[PDB]
Amino acid sequence: PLLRCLVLTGFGGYDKVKLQSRPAAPPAPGPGQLTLRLRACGLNFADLMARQGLYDRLPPLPVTPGMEGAGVVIAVGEGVSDRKAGDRVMVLNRSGMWQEEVTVPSVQTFLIPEAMTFEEAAALLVNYITAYMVLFDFGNLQPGHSVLVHMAAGGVGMAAVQLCRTVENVTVFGTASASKHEALKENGVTHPIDYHTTDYVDEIKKISPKGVDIVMDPLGGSDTAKGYNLLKPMGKVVTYGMANLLTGPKRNLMALARTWWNQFSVTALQLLQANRAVCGFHLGYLDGEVELVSGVVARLLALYNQGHIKPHIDSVWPFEKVADAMKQMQEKKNVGKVLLVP
Amino acid sequence: LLRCLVLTGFGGYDKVKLQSRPAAPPAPGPGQLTLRLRACGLNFADLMARQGLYDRLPPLPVTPGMEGAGVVIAVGEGVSDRKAGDRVMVLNRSGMWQEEVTVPSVQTFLIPEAMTFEEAAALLVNYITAYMVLFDFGNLQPGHSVLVHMAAGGVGMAAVQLCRTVENVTVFGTASASKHEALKENGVTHPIDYHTTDYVDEIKKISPKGVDIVMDPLGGSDTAKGYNLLKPMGKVVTYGMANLLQFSVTALQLLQANRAVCGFHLGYLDGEVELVSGVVARLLALYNQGHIKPHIDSVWPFEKVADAMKQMQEKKNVGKVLLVPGPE
């Protein structure tokens, strides 16, 4: 038979991702490695960034993209003693997850709870690990705090809103199109704001003149500066994405050097006088901290088993319609996770 | 009868004058109280303030000083938690370098029976700073490694002691080689001679990845060195400009490095009485539990305020430098 997979063959529009095949050879994973068949693959903003050549560490083209997936183990290499054929597992990697069969280090896989579906598992890792580390490891989210979650209807955003509810009395401001406000309030947003029909900075200050304690910034650019200045004493803005670029254009423009005009910069003296902190985060740029990531996953699985987090699914697309799947996200039409299925 | 120090201009040590006014009948307004100080703390912030570098500093002439410890002699209406005779420590923007002072009651805290005025006067500024830098911004966690600059200073020592309340924290502290033994004693895992060896190099020998938290009271060119010494998820927190007596980063750079840069200054913290009060409550509990002990370097009467400032400006102090009204 034949195993299918998606291949990025160049940088540019949606048409640069091609569906290709390959002969299914018998599984022979080396030591400490696992071979598995995927049932669902996650789509992340970092994938759109990769596709336009903005990712400093995407392996040499052509390559199969994708950072997360969920599936079944069909083969285990020598050494590994906590995984067996037939185990349902979710997996995290730098690339290569958008295909039917993957071989990876066992330590990069995690057991899926019995009650969790493959779809939920594929929608969990990247979004919730990011939200968790942004809110807790950097933000040090505390009871009585107020948070601004940009793109609150997106995967990370929805994960962030849900996590904010696991802490007492946290006021959540969330930005997204008015058309999604109802879903925003149902997920846990306190004050939904349409950054397209209003000025979100003013809209937040009318309600909380002092500002907020944490700003989650997946936008970057001139929005980082607005986040920083929206901070209350002891607050922090955490940048984990550059949506103000990777979104909109179907092909990257080299006149993005102009983008420099809007890059946010800070001096220690400014931070000192304002009692603020600016932080940066990207799971795709996190260097070999398996023990750190693993501890976070465990926390998330416990929250799941207790009914406190539930990955919401926006849509599921077959490898054949990857173009539309990427469009769903880039055009900001999704409410929840966008997944791909073999 | 009552003495008080006054900053009559921005300059060196000579700018601080010692005046004396007659004792008037205490008349605390609503929610405020009056107290007689027994000890006043000396901080770097005061040297900056005296150098015309503090933007929240009242108009000259003014009495400098952020902390003191003393006895309550009069309470106003509304205040039901204080009575004449109570021993308290107090935090303020200024005005603490004098014998008598009137302040908002919510800015004072009761001193434990076992703690002395001297210790109380050495507690607030230094330990609140170390606590909020290590926990609020740093989010200190077990198994973490921390770089404490000026480990033998007031904030430095408070920090080392606070790191020891969290399990398995590795502490790198810099100071004169002649202060290394007192460093080991206070809890420093790896003392570094700032003056003879490159601390960046000395630290990477032991921990290649770097450290989780860098405490920067120096500022200037050390902020940058601290930044590049951070492990993933690490943060450098600047709370002083001690070198003055530059560093610049973009959000994109932070994103690709998974790092944070923070700034702290108890003097620019506005109206956050609930926040600070929360920290002091935890600091007191630790003292009663025996986890913190403010160390006093030297005590000076108001007449020798110059010597007190000089003592700290020349980095001769190992612990807190204090001021006492002194003998008549």
Side-chain angles (χ1 to χ4, degrees), chain B residues 107-112 114-128:
Chain B
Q107 298 186 197
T108 68
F109 308 102
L110 292 173
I111 309 174
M115 184 180 277
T116 70
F117 291 116
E118 281 81 348
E119 300 178 316
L123 183 71
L124 299 179
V125 173
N126 285 180
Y127 287 72
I128 278 167

mmCIF file with all atom_site columns, all heavy atoms in Angstrom, chain B residues 107-128, unseen atoms left out:
data_model
loop_
_atom_site.group_PDB
_atom_site.id
_atom_site.type_symbol
_atom_site.label_atom_id
_atom_site.label_alt_id
_atom_site.label_comp_id
_atom_site.label_asym_id
_atom_site.label_entity_id
_atom_site.label_seq_id
_atom_site.pdbx_PDB_ins_code
_atom_site.Cartn_x
_atom_site.Cartn_y
_atom_site.Cartn_z
_atom_site.occupancy
_atom_site.B_iso_or_equiv
_atom_site.pdbx_formal_charge
_atom_site.auth_seq_id
_atom_site.auth_comp_id
_atom_site.auth_asym_id
_atom_site.auth_atom_id
_atom_site.pdbx_PDB_model_num
ATOM 1   N N   . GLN B 1 107 ? 0.251  52.200 56.164 1.00 0.00 ? 107 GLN B N   1
ATOM 2   C CA  . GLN B 1 107 ? 1.628  52.118 55.689 1.00 0.00 ? 107 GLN B CA  1
ATOM 3   C C   . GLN B 1 107 ? 2.568  51.675 56.812 1.00 0.00 ? 107 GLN B C   1
ATOM 4   O O   . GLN B 1 107 ? 3.785  51.665 56.646 1.00 0.00 ? 107 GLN B O   1
ATOM 5   C CB  . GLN B 1 107 ? 2.084  53.458 55.115 1.00 0.00 ? 107 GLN B CB  1
ATOM 6   C CG  . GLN B 1 107 ? 1.274  53.911 53.906 1.00 0.00 ? 107 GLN B CG  1
ATOM 7   C CD  . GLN B 1 107 ? 1.821  55.176 53.259 1.00 0.00 ? 107 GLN B CD  1
ATOM 8   O OE1 . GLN B 1 107 ? 1.130  55.840 52.484 1.00 0.00 ? 107 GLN B OE1 1
ATOM 9   N NE2 . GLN B 1 107 ? 3.072  55.506 53.562 1.00 0.00 ? 107 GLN B NE2 1
ATOM 10  N N   . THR B 1 108 ? 1.991  51.302 57.952 1.00 0.00 ? 108 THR B N   1
ATOM 11  C CA  . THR B 1 108 ? 2.773  50.835 59.090 1.00 0.00 ? 108 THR B CA  1
ATOM 12  C C   . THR B 1 108 ? 2.423  49.379 59.368 1.00 0.00 ? 108 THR B C   1
ATOM 13  O O   . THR B 1 108 ? 1.334  48.922 59.022 1.00 0.00 ? 108 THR B O   1
ATOM 14  C CB  . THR B 1 108 ? 2.474  51.634 60.366 1.00 0.00 ? 108 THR B CB  1
ATOM 15  O OG1 . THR B 1 108 ? 1.136  51.358 60.800 1.00 0.00 ? 108 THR B OG1 1
ATOM 16  C CG2 . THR B 1 108 ? 2.637  53.115 60.111 1.00 0.00 ? 108 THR B CG2 1
ATOM 17  N N   . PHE B 1 109 ? 3.344  48.660 60.003 1.00 0.00 ? 109 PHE B N   1
ATOM 18  C CA  . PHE B 1 109 ? 3.133  47.247 60.320 1.00 0.00 ? 109 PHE B CA  1
ATOM 19  C C   . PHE B 1 109 ? 3.655  46.964 61.723 1.00 0.00 ? 109 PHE B C   1
ATOM 20  O O   . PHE B 1 109 ? 4.666  47.533 62.148 1.00 0.00 ? 109 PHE B O   1
ATOM 21  C CB  . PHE B 1 109 ? 3.870  46.380 59.298 1.00 0.00 ? 109 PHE B CB  1
ATOM 22  C CG  . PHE B 1 109 ? 3.550  46.728 57.876 1.00 0.00 ? 109 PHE B CG  1
ATOM 23  C CD1 . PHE B 1 109 ? 4.436  47.487 57.115 1.00 0.00 ? 109 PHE B CD1 1
ATOM 24  C CD2 . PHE B 1 109 ? 2.335  46.348 57.311 1.00 0.00 ? 109 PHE B CD2 1
ATOM 25  C CE1 . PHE B 1 109 ? 4.113  47.868 55.809 1.00 0.00 ? 109 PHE B CE1 1
ATOM 26  C CE2 . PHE B 1 109 ? 2.000  46.721 56.006 1.00 0.00 ? 109 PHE B CE2 1
ATOM 27  C CZ  . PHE B 1 109 ? 2.890  47.484 55.254 1.00 0.00 ? 109 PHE B CZ  1
ATOM 28  N N   . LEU B 1 110 ? 2.968  46.094 62.451 1.00 0.00 ? 110 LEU B N   1
ATOM 29  C CA  . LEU B 1 110 ? 3.394  45.774 63.804 1.00 0.00 ? 110 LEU B CA  1
ATOM 30  C C   . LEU B 1 110 ? 4.668  44.933 63.830 1.00 0.00 ? 110 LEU B C   1
ATOM 31  O O   . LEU B 1 110 ? 4.800  43.948 63.104 1.00 0.00 ? 110 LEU B O   1
ATOM 32  C CB  . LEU B 1 110 ? 2.265  45.062 64.553 1.00 0.00 ? 110 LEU B CB  1
ATOM 33  C CG  . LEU B 1 110 ? 1.054  45.959 64.829 1.00 0.00 ? 110 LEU B CG  1
ATOM 34  C CD1 . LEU B 1 110 ? -0.077 45.141 65.420 1.00 0.00 ? 110 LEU B CD1 1
ATOM 35  C CD2 . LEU B 1 110 ? 1.457  47.085 65.786 1.00 0.00 ? 110 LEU B CD2 1
ATOM 36  N N   . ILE B 1 111 ? 5.609  45.344 64.670 1.00 0.00 ? 111 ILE B N   1
ATOM 37  C CA  . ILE B 1 111 ? 6.877  44.646 64.814 1.00 0.00 ? 111 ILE B CA  1
ATOM 38  C C   . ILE B 1 111 ? 6.751  43.493 65.810 1.00 0.00 ? 111 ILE B C   1
ATOM 39  O O   . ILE B 1 111 ? 6.290  43.687 66.937 1.00 0.00 ? 111 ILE B O   1
ATOM 40  C CB  . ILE B 1 111 ? 7.968  45.602 65.341 1.00 0.00 ? 111 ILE B CB  1
ATOM 41  C CG1 . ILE B 1 111 ? 7.992  46.874 64.487 1.00 0.00 ? 111 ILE B CG1 1
ATOM 42  C CG2 . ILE B 1 111 ? 9.330  44.895 65.355 1.00 0.00 ? 111 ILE B CG2 1
ATOM 43  C CD1 . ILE B 1 111 ? 8.918  47.942 65.009 1.00 0.00 ? 111 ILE B CD1 1
ATOM 44  N N   . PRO B 1 112 ? 7.161  42.277 65.407 1.00 0.00 ? 112 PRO B N   1
ATOM 45  C CA  . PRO B 1 112 ? 7.080  41.120 66.312 1.00 0.00 ? 112 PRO B CA  1
ATOM 46  C C   . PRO B 1 112 ? 7.817  41.410 67.634 1.00 0.00 ? 112 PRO B C   1
ATOM 47  O O   . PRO B 1 112 ? 8.822  42.130 67.648 1.00 0.00 ? 112 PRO B O   1
ATOM 48  C CB  . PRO B 1 112 ? 7.751  40.009 65.509 1.00 0.00 ? 112 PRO B CB  1
ATOM 49  C CG  . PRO B 1 112 ? 7.421  40.378 64.096 1.00 0.00 ? 112 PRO B CG  1
ATOM 50  C CD  . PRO B 1 112 ? 7.638  41.874 64.074 1.00 0.00 ? 112 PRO B CD  1
ATOM 51  N N   . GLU B 1 113 ? 7.316  40.856 68.736 1.00 0.00 ? 113 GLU B N   1
ATOM 52  C CA  . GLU B 1 113 ? 7.925  41.069 70.052 1.00 0.00 ? 113 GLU B CA  1
ATOM 53  C C   . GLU B 1 113 ? 9.445  40.826 70.103 1.00 0.00 ? 113 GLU B C   1
ATOM 54  O O   . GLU B 1 113 ? 10.190 41.602 70.717 1.00 0.00 ? 113 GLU B O   1
ATOM 55  C CB  . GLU B 1 113 ? 7.237  40.179 71.092 1.00 0.00 ? 113 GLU B CB  1
ATOM 56  N N   . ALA B 1 114 ? 9.899  39.757 69.452 1.00 0.00 ? 114 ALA B N   1
ATOM 57  C CA  . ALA B 1 114 ? 11.316 39.393 69.444 1.00 0.00 ? 114 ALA B CA  1
ATOM 58  C C   . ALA B 1 114 ? 12.236 40.265 68.592 1.00 0.00 ? 114 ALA B C   1
ATOM 59  O O   . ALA B 1 114 ? 13.429 40.357 68.871 1.00 0.00 ? 114 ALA B O   1
ATOM 60  C CB  . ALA B 1 114 ? 11.467 37.936 69.020 1.00 0.00 ? 114 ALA B CB  1
ATOM 61  N N   . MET B 1 115 ? 11.687 40.902 67.564 1.00 0.00 ? 115 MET B N   1
ATOM 62  C CA  . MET B 1 115 ? 12.476 41.741 66.661 1.00 0.00 ? 115 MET B CA  1
ATOM 63  C C   . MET B 1 115 ? 12.766 43.116 67.261 1.00 0.00 ? 115 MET B C   1
ATOM 64  O O   . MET B 1 115 ? 11.898 43.710 67.894 1.00 0.00 ? 115 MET B O   1
ATOM 65  C CB  . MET B 1 115 ? 11.719 41.900 65.337 1.00 0.00 ? 115 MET B CB  1
ATOM 66  C CG  . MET B 1 115 ? 12.444 42.676 64.240 1.00 0.00 ? 115 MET B CG  1
ATOM 67  S SD  . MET B 1 115 ? 11.441 42.784 62.719 1.00 0.00 ? 115 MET B SD  1
ATOM 68  C CE  . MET B 1 115 ? 11.794 41.209 61.951 1.00 0.00 ? 115 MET B CE  1
ATOM 69  N N   . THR B 1 116 ? 13.984 43.618 67.059 1.00 0.00 ? 116 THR B N   1
ATOM 70  C CA  . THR B 1 116 ? 14.367 44.940 67.568 1.00 0.00 ? 116 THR B CA  1
ATOM 71  C C   . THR B 1 116 ? 14.045 46.047 66.555 1.00 0.00 ? 116 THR B C   1
ATOM 72  O O   . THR B 1 116 ? 13.797 45.768 65.381 1.00 0.00 ? 116 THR B O   1
ATOM 73  C CB  . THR B 1 116 ? 15.875 45.013 67.859 1.00 0.00 ? 116 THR B CB  1
ATOM 74  O OG1 . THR B 1 116 ? 16.602 44.993 66.621 1.00 0.00 ? 116 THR B OG1 1
ATOM 75  C CG2 . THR B 1 116 ? 16.313 43.827 68.733 1.00 0.00 ? 116 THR B CG2 1
ATOM 76  N N   . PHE B 1 117 ? 14.056 47.297 67.014 1.00 0.00 ? 117 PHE B N   1
ATOM 77  C CA  . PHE B 1 117 ? 13.789 48.445 66.140 1.00 0.00 ? 117 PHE B CA  1
ATOM 78  C C   . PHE B 1 117 ? 14.838 48.465 65.027 1.00 0.00 ? 117 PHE B C   1
ATOM 79  O O   . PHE B 1 117 ? 14.538 48.774 63.872 1.00 0.00 ? 117 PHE B O   1
ATOM 80  C CB  . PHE B 1 117 ? 13.890 49.764 66.919 1.00 0.00 ? 117 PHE B CB  1
ATOM 81  C CG  . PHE B 1 117 ? 12.799 49.970 67.930 1.00 0.00 ? 117 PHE B CG  1
ATOM 82  C CD1 . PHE B 1 117 ? 13.098 50.042 69.290 1.00 0.00 ? 117 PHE B CD1 1
ATOM 83  C CD2 . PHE B 1 117 ? 11.475 50.114 67.528 1.00 0.00 ? 117 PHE B CD2 1
ATOM 84  C CE1 . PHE B 1 117 ? 12.088 50.258 70.240 1.00 0.00 ? 117 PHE B CE1 1
ATOM 85  C CE2 . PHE B 1 117 ? 10.465 50.327 68.460 1.00 0.00 ? 117 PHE B CE2 1
ATOM 86  C CZ  . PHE B 1 117 ? 10.774 50.400 69.819 1.00 0.00 ? 117 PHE B CZ  1
ATOM 87  N N   . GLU B 1 118 ? 16.074 48.156 65.394 1.00 0.00 ? 118 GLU B N   1
ATOM 88  C CA  . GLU B 1 118 ? 17.157 48.132 64.431 1.00 0.00 ? 118 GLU B CA  1
ATOM 89  C C   . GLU B 1 118 ? 16.867 47.136 63.321 1.00 0.00 ? 118 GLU B C   1
ATOM 90  O O   . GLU B 1 118 ? 17.049 47.449 62.147 1.00 0.00 ? 118 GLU B O   1
ATOM 91  C CB  . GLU B 1 118 ? 18.491 47.778 65.104 1.00 0.00 ? 118 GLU B CB  1
ATOM 92  C CG  . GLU B 1 118 ? 19.145 48.943 65.839 1.00 0.00 ? 118 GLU B CG  1
ATOM 93  C CD  . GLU B 1 118 ? 18.557 49.173 67.218 1.00 0.00 ? 118 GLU B CD  1
ATOM 94  O OE1 . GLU B 1 118 ? 17.496 48.592 67.528 1.00 0.00 ? 118 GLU B OE1 1
ATOM 95  O OE2 . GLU B 1 118 ? 19.161 49.936 67.999 1.00 0.00 ? 118 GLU B OE2 1
ATOM 96  N N   . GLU B 1 119 ? 16.413 45.943 63.696 1.00 0.00 ? 119 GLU B N   1
ATOM 97  C CA  . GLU B 1 119 ? 16.112 44.904 62.716 1.00 0.00 ? 119 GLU B CA  1
ATOM 98  C C   . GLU B 1 119 ? 14.896 45.294 61.884 1.00 0.00 ? 119 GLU B C   1
ATOM 99  O O   . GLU B 1 119 ? 14.896 45.116 60.663 1.00 0.00 ? 119 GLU B O   1
ATOM 100 C CB  . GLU B 1 119 ? 15.889 43.557 63.421 1.00 0.00 ? 119 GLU B CB  1
ATOM 101 C CG  . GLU B 1 119 ? 17.110 43.094 64.202 1.00 0.00 ? 119 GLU B CG  1
ATOM 102 C CD  . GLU B 1 119 ? 16.897 41.782 64.947 1.00 0.00 ? 119 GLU B CD  1
ATOM 103 O OE1 . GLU B 1 119 ? 15.833 41.608 65.583 1.00 0.00 ? 119 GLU B OE1 1
ATOM 104 O OE2 . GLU B 1 119 ? 17.812 40.932 64.907 1.00 0.00 ? 119 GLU B OE2 1
ATOM 105 N N   . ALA B 1 120 ? 13.878 45.845 62.547 1.00 0.00 ? 120 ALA B N   1
ATOM 106 C CA  . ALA B 1 120 ? 12.666 46.284 61.869 1.00 0.00 ? 120 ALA B CA  1
ATOM 107 C C   . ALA B 1 120 ? 13.004 47.360 60.828 1.00 0.00 ? 120 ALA B C   1
ATOM 108 O O   . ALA B 1 120 ? 12.499 47.338 59.705 1.00 0.00 ? 120 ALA B O   1
ATOM 109 C CB  . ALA B 1 120 ? 11.678 46.825 62.885 1.00 0.00 ? 120 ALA B CB  1
ATOM 110 N N   . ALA B 1 121 ? 13.875 48.291 61.203 1.00 0.00 ? 121 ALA B N   1
ATOM 111 C CA  . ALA B 1 121 ? 14.287 49.366 60.302 1.00 0.00 ? 121 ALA B CA  1
ATOM 112 C C   . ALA B 1 121 ? 15.082 48.821 59.118 1.00 0.00 ? 121 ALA B C   1
ATOM 113 O O   . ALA B 1 121 ? 15.227 49.489 58.094 1.00 0.00 ? 121 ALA B O   1
ATOM 114 C CB  . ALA B 1 121 ? 15.132 50.393 61.064 1.00 0.00 ? 121 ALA B CB  1
ATOM 115 N N   . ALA B 1 122 ? 15.600 47.607 59.258 1.00 0.00 ? 122 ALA B N   1
ATOM 116 C CA  . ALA B 1 122 ? 16.391 47.005 58.192 1.00 0.00 ? 122 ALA B CA  1
ATOM 117 C C   . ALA B 1 122 ? 15.592 46.019 57.339 1.00 0.00 ? 122 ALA B C   1
ATOM 118 O O   . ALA B 1 122 ? 16.092 45.535 56.320 1.00 0.00 ? 122 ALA B O   1
ATOM 119 C CB  . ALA B 1 122 ? 17.601 46.308 58.787 1.00 0.00 ? 122 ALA B CB  1
ATOM 120 N N   . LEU B 1 123 ? 14.354 45.746 57.746 1.00 0.00 ? 123 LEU B N   1
ATOM 121 C CA  . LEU B 1 123 ? 13.504 44.780 57.053 1.00 0.00 ? 123 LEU B CA  1
ATOM 122 C C   . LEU B 1 123 ? 12.749 45.161 55.768 1.00 0.00 ? 123 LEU B C   1
ATOM 123 O O   . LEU B 1 123 ? 12.979 44.566 54.711 1.00 0.00 ? 123 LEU B O   1
ATOM 124 C CB  . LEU B 1 123 ? 12.475 44.206 58.033 1.00 0.00 ? 123 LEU B CB  1
ATOM 125 C CG  . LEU B 1 123 ? 11.575 43.132 57.409 1.00 0.00 ? 123 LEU B CG  1
ATOM 126 C CD1 . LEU B 1 123 ? 12.411 41.897 57.179 1.00 0.00 ? 123 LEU B CD1 1
ATOM 127 C CD2 . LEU B 1 123 ? 10.395 42.811 58.300 1.00 0.00 ? 123 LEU B CD2 1
ATOM 128 N N   . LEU B 1 124 ? 11.840 46.129 55.870 1.00 0.00 ? 124 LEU B N   1
ATOM 129 C CA  . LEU B 1 124 ? 10.984 46.531 54.750 1.00 0.00 ? 124 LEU B CA  1
ATOM 130 C C   . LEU B 1 124 ? 11.552 46.736 53.356 1.00 0.00 ? 124 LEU B C   1
ATOM 131 O O   . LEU B 1 124 ? 11.304 45.922 52.470 1.00 0.00 ? 124 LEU B O   1
ATOM 132 C CB  . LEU B 1 124 ? 10.157 47.757 55.141 1.00 0.00 ? 124 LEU B CB  1
ATOM 133 C CG  . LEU B 1 124 ? 9.207  47.528 56.325 1.00 0.00 ? 124 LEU B CG  1
ATOM 134 C CD1 . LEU B 1 124 ? 8.458  48.831 56.643 1.00 0.00 ? 124 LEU B CD1 1
ATOM 135 C CD2 . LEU B 1 124 ? 8.228  46.408 55.998 1.00 0.00 ? 124 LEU B CD2 1
ATOM 136 N N   . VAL B 1 125 ? 12.303 47.803 53.132 1.00 0.00 ? 125 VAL B N   1
ATOM 137 C CA  . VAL B 1 125 ? 12.815 48.035 51.786 1.00 0.00 ? 125 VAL B CA  1
ATOM 138 C C   . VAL B 1 125 ? 13.593 46.874 51.180 1.00 0.00 ? 125 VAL B C   1
ATOM 139 O O   . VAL B 1 125 ? 13.263 46.416 50.084 1.00 0.00 ? 125 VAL B O   1
ATOM 140 C CB  . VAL B 1 125 ? 13.678 49.341 51.694 1.00 0.00 ? 125 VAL B CB  1
ATOM 141 C CG1 . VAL B 1 125 ? 14.332 49.443 50.317 1.00 0.00 ? 125 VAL B CG1 1
ATOM 142 C CG2 . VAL B 1 125 ? 12.790 50.573 51.899 1.00 0.00 ? 125 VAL B CG2 1
ATOM 143 N N   . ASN B 1 126 ? 14.618 46.394 51.879 1.00 0.00 ? 126 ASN B N   1
ATOM 144 C CA  . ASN B 1 126 ? 15.441 45.295 51.364 1.00 0.00 ? 126 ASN B CA  1
ATOM 145 C C   . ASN B 1 126 ? 14.704 43.970 51.127 1.00 0.00 ? 126 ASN B C   1
ATOM 146 O O   . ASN B 1 126 ? 14.834 43.371 50.051 1.00 0.00 ? 126 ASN B O   1
ATOM 147 C CB  . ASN B 1 126 ? 16.637 45.045 52.294 1.00 0.00 ? 126 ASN B CB  1
ATOM 148 C CG  . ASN B 1 126 ? 17.732 46.096 52.153 1.00 0.00 ? 126 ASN B CG  1
ATOM 149 O OD1 . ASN B 1 126 ? 18.755 46.024 52.845 1.00 0.00 ? 126 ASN B OD1 1
ATOM 150 N ND2 . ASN B 1 126 ? 17.531 47.071 51.264 1.00 0.00 ? 126 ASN B ND2 1
ATOM 151 N N   . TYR B 1 127 ? 13.932 43.509 52.111 1.00 0.00 ? 127 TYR B N   1
ATOM 152 C CA  . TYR B 1 127 ? 13.230 42.234 51.956 1.00 0.00 ? 127 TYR B CA  1
ATOM 153 C C   . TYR B 1 127 ? 11.991 42.276 51.040 1.00 0.00 ? 127 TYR B C   1
ATOM 154 O O   . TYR B 1 127 ? 11.640 41.266 50.417 1.00 0.00 ? 127 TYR B O   1
ATOM 155 C CB  . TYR B 1 127 ? 12.900 41.633 53.336 1.00 0.00 ? 127 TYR B CB  1
ATOM 156 C CG  . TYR B 1 127 ? 14.125 41.077 54.068 1.00 0.00 ? 127 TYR B CG  1
ATOM 157 C CD1 . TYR B 1 127 ? 15.093 41.932 54.616 1.00 0.00 ? 127 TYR B CD1 1
ATOM 158 C CD2 . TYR B 1 127 ? 14.342 39.697 54.161 1.00 0.00 ? 127 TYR B CD2 1
ATOM 159 C CE1 . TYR B 1 127 ? 16.248 41.429 55.228 1.00 0.00 ? 127 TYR B CE1 1
ATOM 160 C CE2 . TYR B 1 127 ? 15.483 39.182 54.769 1.00 0.00 ? 127 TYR B CE2 1
ATOM 161 C CZ  . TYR B 1 127 ? 16.434 40.051 55.301 1.00 0.00 ? 127 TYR B CZ  1
ATOM 162 O OH  . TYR B 1 127 ? 17.558 39.532 55.907 1.00 0.00 ? 127 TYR B OH  1
ATOM 163 N N   . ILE B 1 128 ? 11.338 43.431 50.947 1.00 0.00 ? 128 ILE B N   1
ATOM 164 C CA  . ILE B 1 128 ? 10.187 43.560 50.055 1.00 0.00 ? 128 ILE B CA  1
ATOM 165 C C   . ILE B 1 128 ? 10.729 43.503 48.627 1.00 0.00 ? 128 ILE B C   1
ATOM 166 O O   . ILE B 1 128 ? 10.151 42.850 47.760 1.00 0.00 ? 128 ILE B O   1
ATOM 167 C CB  . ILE B 1 128 ? 9.446  44.903 50.260 1.00 0.00 ? 128 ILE B CB  1
ATOM 168 C CG1 . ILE B 1 128 ? 8.511  44.792 51.459 1.00 0.00 ? 128 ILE B CG1 1
ATOM 169 C CG2 . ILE B 1 128 ? 8.674  45.288 49.006 1.00 0.00 ? 128 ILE B CG2 1
ATOM 170 C CD1 . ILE B 1 128 ? 7.983  46.126 51.944 1.00 0.00 ? 128 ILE B CD1 1
#
